[PDB]
Symmetry: C2
Subunit: 123 residues, 2 copies
């Protein structure tokens, strides 16, 4: 059902778990079949699992960690702070991101927006 505030915290934490390990199939499955992702926010969205699986395969030596608690509401939404660590063209770098997600009546991510730009990159 529509996740409660406590379920939202668990779902979003799991999401970072999946990105950290790199389980692309398990990540794609958290989304609704017709979900949209705007990463980075400001850029046009990608829609549907096919486009989302391609987005994740492209992007995913990467480790992500929640850098603070997940803020959750009572209407199936949440926002969380986290850091992603990669190694860009030999040089290892970090990106601080804030993800805002809205879940549907099935506990699946219906919409996801990631806030970050080059001001949050430490190369």
């Amino acid at each position: 059902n529509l996740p409660t505030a406590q379920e939202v915290q668990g779902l979003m934490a799991r999401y970072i778990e999946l990105v950290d390990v790199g389980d692309i199939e398990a990540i794609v499955q958290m989304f609704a079949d017709d979900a949209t992702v705007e990463d980075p926010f400001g850029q046009p969205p990608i829609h549907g699992r096919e486009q989302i699986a391609a987005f994740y395969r492209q992007g995913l030596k990467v480790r992500a960690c929640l850098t603070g608690p997940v803020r959750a509401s009572h209407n199936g939404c949440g926002a969380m702070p986290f850091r992603v660590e990669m190694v860009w063209n030999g040089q290892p770098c970090a990106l601080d991101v804030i993800d805002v997600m809205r879940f549907d009546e099935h506990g699946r991510i219906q919409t996801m927006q990631a806030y970050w730009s080059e001001v949050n990159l430490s190369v």
Copy 2:
């Protein structure tokens, strides 16, 4: 003008500065005359400076601090993690919040949403 990613970081940081000191007049002035605030997200918005000034006077012994960097985009939006510390009915408590703001072509907060619920309160 529409704040750049670096201006957004500065504006949002200033916002927390103002809340921390408790300068209600300076806070209200960062908003557009017709801005809307949804705090907590999920609750219906308050519109316009009058309603916003009343909201801030009601709420503002409170100190707020950015608990992580401000994530900013290229379209005048940003999201930031912070903690508010108060003393509720004698007992001091903390609230972890994530604010997502959208600025207008004047560098004024046009829309503001705060993510938190009782799951982020430590009384």
